Design a protein around this motif. Structure first.
Motif, PDB file in Angstrom:
ATOM      1  N   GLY A 142      41.162 -33.383  -2.757  1.00  0.00           N
ATOM      2  CA  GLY A 142      42.113 -34.152  -4.076  1.00  0.00           C
ATOM      3  C   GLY A 142      43.561 -34.431  -3.168  1.00  0.00           C
ATOM      4  O   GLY A 142      44.537 -34.004  -3.689  1.00  0.00           O
ATOM      5  N   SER A 143      43.367 -35.198  -1.990  1.00  0.00           N
ATOM      6  CA  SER A 143      44.717 -35.506  -1.263  1.00  0.00           C
ATOM      7  C   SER A 143      44.789 -36.963  -1.496  1.00  0.00           C
ATOM      8  O   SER A 143      43.896 -37.811  -0.723  1.00  0.00           O
ATOM      9  N   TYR A 144      45.730 -37.511  -2.075  1.00  0.00           N
ATOM     10  CA  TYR A 144      46.261 -39.035  -2.212  1.00  0.00           C
ATOM     11  C   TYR A 144      46.600 -39.301  -0.821  1.00  0.00           C
ATOM     12  O   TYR A 144      47.391 -38.581  -0.267  1.00  0.00           O
ATOM     13  N   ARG A 145      46.071 -40.429  -0.107  1.00  0.00           N
ATOM     14  CA  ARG A 145      46.717 -40.687   1.255  1.00  0.00           C
ATOM     15  C   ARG A 145      46.555 -42.169   1.336  1.00  0.00           C
ATOM     16  O   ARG A 145      45.291 -42.938   0.756  1.00  0.00           O
ATOM     17  N   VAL A 146      47.422 -43.283   1.566  1.00  0.00           N
ATOM     18  CA  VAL A 146      47.332 -44.623   1.863  1.00  0.00           C
ATOM     19  C   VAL A 146      47.685 -44.534   3.410  1.00  0.00           C
ATOM     20  O   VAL A 146      48.696 -44.189   3.877  1.00  0.00           O
ATOM     21  N   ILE A 147      46.864 -45.460   3.972  1.00  0.00           N
ATOM     22  CA  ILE A 147      47.159 -45.520   5.469  1.00  0.00           C
ATOM     23  C   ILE A 147      47.091 -47.092   5.937  1.00  0.00           C
ATOM     24  O   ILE A 147      46.349 -47.908   5.242  1.00  0.00           O
ATOM     25  N   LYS A 148      47.834 -47.664   6.814  1.00  0.00           N
ATOM     26  CA  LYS A 148      48.039 -48.766   7.257  1.00  0.00           C
ATOM     27  C   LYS A 148      47.817 -48.981   8.728  1.00  0.00           C
ATOM     28  O   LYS A 148      48.797 -47.993   9.255  1.00  0.00           O
ATOM     29  N   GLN A 149      47.339 -49.900   9.347  1.00  0.00           N
ATOM     30  CA  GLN A 149      46.870 -49.831  10.801  1.00  0.00           C
ATOM     31  C   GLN A 149      47.293 -51.287  11.350  1.00  0.00           C
ATOM     32  O   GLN A 149      46.855 -52.232  10.498  1.00  0.00           O
ATOM     33  N   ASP A 150      47.771 -51.375  12.411  1.00  0.00           N
ATOM     34  CA  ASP A 150      48.136 -52.884  13.153  1.00  0.00           C
ATOM     35  C   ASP A 150      47.205 -53.206  14.257  1.00  0.00           C
ATOM     36  O   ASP A 150      47.189 -54.341  14.640  1.00  0.00           O
ATOM     37  N   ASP A 151      46.467 -51.991  15.076  1.00  0.00           N
ATOM     38  CA  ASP A 151      46.142 -52.374  16.241  1.00  0.00           C
ATOM     39  C   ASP A 151      44.628 -51.625  16.442  1.00  0.00           C
ATOM     40  O   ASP A 151      44.218 -51.629  17.432  1.00  0.00           O
ATOM     41  N   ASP A 152      44.153 -50.852  15.320  1.00  0.00           N
ATOM     42  CA  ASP A 152      43.034 -49.971  15.420  1.00  0.00           C
ATOM     43  C   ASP A 152      42.316 -50.037  13.904  1.00  0.00           C
ATOM     44  O   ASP A 152      43.059 -49.756  12.957  1.00  0.00           O
ATOM     45  N   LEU A 153      41.150 -50.507  13.871  1.00  0.00           N
ATOM     46  CA  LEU A 153      40.309 -50.364  12.497  1.00  0.00           C
ATOM     47  C   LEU A 153      40.105 -48.963  12.380  1.00  0.00           C
ATOM     48  O   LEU A 153      40.067 -48.525  11.330  1.00  0.00           O
TER      49      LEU A 153
ATOM     50  N   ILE B 230      49.948 -37.382  -0.808  1.00  0.00           N
ATOM     51  CA  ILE B 230      49.606 -36.273  -1.183  1.00  0.00           C
ATOM     52  C   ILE B 230      48.600 -35.599  -0.483  1.00  0.00           C
ATOM     53  O   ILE B 230      47.637 -35.828  -0.365  1.00  0.00           O
ATOM     54  N   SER B 231      49.111 -34.580   0.553  1.00  0.00           N
ATOM     55  CA  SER B 231      48.302 -33.870   1.557  1.00  0.00           C
ATOM     56  C   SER B 231      47.413 -32.885   0.521  1.00  0.00           C
ATOM     57  O   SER B 231      47.930 -32.686  -0.513  1.00  0.00           O
ATOM     58  N   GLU B 232      46.566 -32.299   1.382  1.00  0.00           N
ATOM     59  CA  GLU B 232      45.622 -31.235   0.892  1.00  0.00           C
ATOM     60  C   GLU B 232      46.420 -30.144   0.276  1.00  0.00           C
ATOM     61  O   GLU B 232      46.166 -29.415  -0.536  1.00  0.00           O
ATOM     62  N   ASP B 233      47.635 -29.977   0.798  1.00  0.00           N
ATOM     63  CA  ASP B 233      48.704 -28.943   0.253  1.00  0.00           C
ATOM     64  C   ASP B 233      49.676 -29.686  -0.483  1.00  0.00           C
ATOM     65  O   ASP B 233      49.896 -30.857  -0.095  1.00  0.00           O
ATOM     66  N   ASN B 234      50.262 -29.170  -1.492  1.00  0.00           N
ATOM     67  CA  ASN B 234      51.225 -29.784  -2.511  1.00  0.00           C
ATOM     68  C   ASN B 234      52.533 -30.190  -1.715  1.00  0.00           C
ATOM     69  O   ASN B 234      53.660 -29.476  -1.764  1.00  0.00           O
ATOM     70  N   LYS B 235      52.648 -31.130  -1.032  1.00  0.00           N
ATOM     71  CA  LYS B 235      53.779 -31.819  -0.206  1.00  0.00           C
ATOM     72  C   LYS B 235      53.693 -33.246  -0.179  1.00  0.00           C
ATOM     73  O   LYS B 235      52.662 -33.981   0.254  1.00  0.00           O
ATOM     74  N   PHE B 236      54.577 -34.012  -1.026  1.00  0.00           N
ATOM     75  CA  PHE B 236      54.886 -35.423  -0.951  1.00  0.00           C
ATOM     76  C   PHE B 236      55.466 -35.725   0.339  1.00  0.00           C
ATOM     77  O   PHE B 236      56.655 -35.040   0.776  1.00  0.00           O
ATOM     78  N   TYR B 237      54.866 -36.768   1.119  1.00  0.00           N
ATOM     79  CA  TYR B 237      55.459 -37.047   2.056  1.00  0.00           C
ATOM     80  C   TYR B 237      55.384 -38.470   2.899  1.00  0.00           C
ATOM     81  O   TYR B 237      54.381 -39.221   2.234  1.00  0.00           O
ATOM     82  N   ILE B 238      56.320 -39.232   3.495  1.00  0.00           N
ATOM     83  CA  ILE B 238      56.042 -40.505   4.078  1.00  0.00           C
ATOM     84  C   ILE B 238      56.340 -40.144   5.494  1.00  0.00           C
ATOM     85  O   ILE B 238      57.218 -39.604   6.009  1.00  0.00           O
ATOM     86  N   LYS B 239      55.265 -40.564   6.273  1.00  0.00           N
ATOM     87  CA  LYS B 239      55.301 -40.358   7.649  1.00  0.00           C
ATOM     88  C   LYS B 239      54.798 -41.427   8.640  1.00  0.00           C
ATOM     89  O   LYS B 239      53.966 -42.259   7.838  1.00  0.00           O
ATOM     90  N   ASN B 240      55.429 -41.726   9.834  1.00  0.00           N
ATOM     91  CA  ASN B 240      55.072 -42.751  10.757  1.00  0.00           C
ATOM     92  C   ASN B 240      55.086 -42.108  12.322  1.00  0.00           C
ATOM     93  O   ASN B 240      54.697 -40.848  12.315  1.00  0.00           O
ATOM     94  N   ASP B 241      55.080 -43.149  13.037  1.00  0.00           N
ATOM     95  CA  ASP B 241      55.294 -42.655  14.638  1.00  0.00           C
ATOM     96  C   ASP B 241      56.718 -41.933  14.551  1.00  0.00           C
ATOM     97  O   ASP B 241      56.650 -40.821  15.470  1.00  0.00           O
ATOM     98  N   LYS B 242      57.596 -42.222  13.960  1.00  0.00           N
ATOM     99  CA  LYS B 242      58.900 -41.532  13.976  1.00  0.00           C
ATOM    100  C   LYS B 242      58.704 -40.383  13.268  1.00  0.00           C
ATOM    101  O   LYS B 242      57.663 -40.263  12.348  1.00  0.00           O
ATOM    102  N   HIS B 243      59.630 -39.524  13.255  1.00  0.00           N
ATOM    103  CA  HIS B 243      59.819 -38.409  12.134  1.00  0.00           C
ATOM    104  C   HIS B 243      59.604 -38.697  10.902  1.00  0.00           C
ATOM    105  O   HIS B 243      60.287 -39.585  10.518  1.00  0.00           O
ATOM    106  N   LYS B 244      59.209 -37.734  10.198  1.00  0.00           N
ATOM    107  CA  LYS B 244      58.455 -38.089   8.662  1.00  0.00           C
ATOM    108  C   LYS B 244      59.801 -37.680   7.669  1.00  0.00           C
ATOM    109  O   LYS B 244      60.864 -37.189   8.096  1.00  0.00           O
ATOM    110  N   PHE B 245      59.662 -38.311   6.243  1.00  0.00           N
ATOM    111  CA  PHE B 245      60.240 -37.952   5.185  1.00  0.00           C
ATOM    112  C   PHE B 245      59.479 -37.061   4.264  1.00  0.00           C
ATOM    113  O   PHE B 245      58.461 -37.683   3.741  1.00  0.00           O
ATOM    114  N   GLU B 246      59.690 -36.164   3.965  1.00  0.00           N
ATOM    115  CA  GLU B 246      58.769 -34.992   3.431  1.00  0.00           C
ATOM    116  C   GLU B 246      59.652 -34.477   2.210  1.00  0.00           C
ATOM    117  O   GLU B 246      60.950 -34.337   2.206  1.00  0.00           O
ATOM    118  N   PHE B 247      59.009 -34.393   1.021  1.00  0.00           N
ATOM    119  CA  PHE B 247      59.566 -33.682   0.002  1.00  0.00           C
ATOM    120  C   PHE B 247      58.773 -32.391  -0.629  1.00  0.00           C
ATOM    121  O   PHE B 247      57.776 -32.669  -1.278  1.00  0.00           O
TER     122      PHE B 247
END
Lengths: 153, 114, 49
Positions: free
Chosen positions: C1-12, C25-42
């Protein structure tokens, strides 16, 4: 006749009607001829506004279902046959259908031409214009109709 | 063929759903993952994944009024009377929010509130 | 039950992506936005970066 006079008036004013723009199912509530502002109208709504100027009213939005049961038309040629020699017998003001599922219609004008809006599907900015029938003859579908006002109601 | 419209017999709107489940698989463990793609007569859309034995569910719900909402639950399959859960989406009113058991993070049309 | 949307630019493939962005939403109850730089987590309590 009414339909021939209206087609001649539209032909004469075709170059001044550049404000009108093409869309798939443009059904604006403003009359294009009574406003200098641009407005997106399709062929069905265009015919509706053109006939509404006089005393005839027809109905709105005047979709394909209008021609089936309203009894305002009588068919001239049926769908499913397509003869190039019998195009000359047509007369100005006859409605020309296009597409395999009645996607678009047109108004016939002499010298082997027709008046319609053509452009890319997602709300093209091309204005109304007249095209030759030679290239569009493939997608004509042979259906032709005509108007009659004296006997109706 | 005779220039007549093919009326549908029933004019009431349907409600669709694609329910998916099994019994077992080559790993040997009992199958208990349930997922659905229910669509209501009022236009709602609900994509959900469920584990019934473990009492866990994650739903993505759309309301007829047009409310984006994703809900995750840890100890109750029903949406009603959930203790541990997290939500985030667009409410029936124009307000983007992320809320849980603790106080929420909201983004109104103007300003930032917590 | 982990909501996840991923976008990629150079790898299928999802594995071994360099440039990408994720949020959900990760497998644990944590809302987050993450990238190559440090993420924003709630997390369930508080706001972390």
């Amino acid at each position: 006749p009414l339909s021939t006079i209206l087609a001649l008036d539209l032909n004469d004013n075709l170059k001044s009607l550049s404000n009108i723009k093409y869309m798939f199912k443009g059904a604006p509530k403003e009359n294009p001829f009574g406003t200098d502002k641009d407005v997106y109208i399709d062929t069905y709504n265009l015919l509706y506004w053109l006939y509404l100027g006089e005393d005839e009213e027809l109905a709105y939005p005047m979709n394909i279902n209008y021609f089936f049961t309203e009894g305002r038309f009588f068919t001239i040629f049926g769908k499913g046959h397509k003869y190039k020699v019998d195009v000359s017998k047509f007369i100005v003001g006859d409605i020309l259908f296009f597409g395999r599922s009645d996607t678009n219609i047109g108004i016939y004008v002499g010298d082997g031409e027709f008046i319609s809006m053509m452009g890319k599907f997602p709300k093209d900015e091309t204005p109304i214009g007249k095209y030759k029938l030679d290239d569009y003859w493939n997608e004509f579908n042979g259906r032709v109709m005509r108007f009659d006002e004296e006997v109706y109601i | 063929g005779n220039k007549t419209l093919i009326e549908p017999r029933i004019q009431k709107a349907p409600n669709m759903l694609f329910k998916h489940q099994g019994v077992f698989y080559d790993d040997g463990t009992p199958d208990n993952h349930i997922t659905t793609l229910f669509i209501s007569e009022r236009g709602d859309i609900r994509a959900s994944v469920l584990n019934t034995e473990t009492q866990k569910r994650t739903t993505q719900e759309m309301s007829s009024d047009g409310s984006y909402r994703v809900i995750k639950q840890d100890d109750d399959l029903m949406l009603d009377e959930a203790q541990v859960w997290i939500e985030y989406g667009i409410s029936e009113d124009n307000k983007f929010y992320i809320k849980n058991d603790k106080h929420k993070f909201e983004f109104t049309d103007e300003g930032i509130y917590i």
